């Protein structure tokens, strides 16, 4: 017996607040990405990189956000890192809007974002993916999954776990209103190492969990246990992350150091 009572309306207001803030913080939404990927937008059709000849044309004529490395695999990887550094800033801006978050101890805010940004990056990356590939340069290009897989070792396997995650995750058909609450749940995780004060984090999480549950009930009439399934994904996501980390160390051991993002070069 669900009712539309004061408590439920406050959880809906919380969900809308998050949605609005998510729209502000993340320019390329899932709705806008799906419209591009399904050819149901009036916006500019992206350039497709599906082989090396199209990569060269893409970098040349179109100019993609990726002394540059002479090798394609390294330019791609470095581009992904750079974009992820920008993603940290977007995610931090979003975290400031979660009610209660900025009233936490600053060191705990930091620690929550430090351990949560990689999970949120991979969650939101799925929005830009379909079975064929991923949107790049804010939707101006599209790079195929099979092209990414064809990069020389160790870069050929770099995106594959993200695509594998995405196929299954996208099958749940979450929308941006669902995702805004989900990513707030991930940020307010009380089990991150090195947290000072866990209960206030858990109290914010509990309210966000309530809001997610209700959002999912109202928005997904045909998946009665979607809440549980999403919590299971958060359990998963930690593995894309645990395995990115292993991959990175192989990369940093065996490849030339690549350029630092300007923001870091500036920080030191």
């Amino acid at each position: 017996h669900m009712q539309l009572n004061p408590e439920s309306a406050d959880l809906r207001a919380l969900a809308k607040h998050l949605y609005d803030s998510y729209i502000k913080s993340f320019p390329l939404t899932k709705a806008k990405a799906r419209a591009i990927l399904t050819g149901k937008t009036t916006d500019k059709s992206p350039f497709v990189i599906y082989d090396m000849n199209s990569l060269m044309m893409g970098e040349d004529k179109i100019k993609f956000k990726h002394e540059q490395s002479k090798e394609v695999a390294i330019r791609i990887f470095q581009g992904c890192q750079f974009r992820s550094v920008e993603a940290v800033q977007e995610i931090t801006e979003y975290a400031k809007s979660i009610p209660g978050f900025v009233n936490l101890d600053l060191n705990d805010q930091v620690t929550l974002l430090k351990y949560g940004v990689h999970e949120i990056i991979y969650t939101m990356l799925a929005s830009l993916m379909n079975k064929d590939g991923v949107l790049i340069s804010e939707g101006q290009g599209f790079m195929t999954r099979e092209f990414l897989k064809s990069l020389r070792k160790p870069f050929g396997d770099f995106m594959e776990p993200k695509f594998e995650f995405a196929v299954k995750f996208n099958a749940l058909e979450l929308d941006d209103s669902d995702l805004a609450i989900f990513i707030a749940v991930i940020i307010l995780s009380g089990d991150r190492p090195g947290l000072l004060n866990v209960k206030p984090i858990e109290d914010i999480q509990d309210n966000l969990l309530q809001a997610l549950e209700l959002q999912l009930k109202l928005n997904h009439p045909e998946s009665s246990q979607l809440f549980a399934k999403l919590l299971q994904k958060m359990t998963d996501l930690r593995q894309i992350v645990t395995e990115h980390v292993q991959l990175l160390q192989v990369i940093k051991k065996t490849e030339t150091d690549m350029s630092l993002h300007p923001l870091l070069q500036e920080i030191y």
Binding site: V85, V88, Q89, T92, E93, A95, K96, V102, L106, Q109, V110, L113, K114, V117, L263, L264, I267, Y268
Partner: peptide
């Protein structure tokens, strides 16, 4: 380290 400096600045 850098990750942490990125975040602190963004929060400020």
């Amino acid at each position: 380290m850098g990750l942490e400096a990125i975040i602190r600045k963004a929060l400020m």
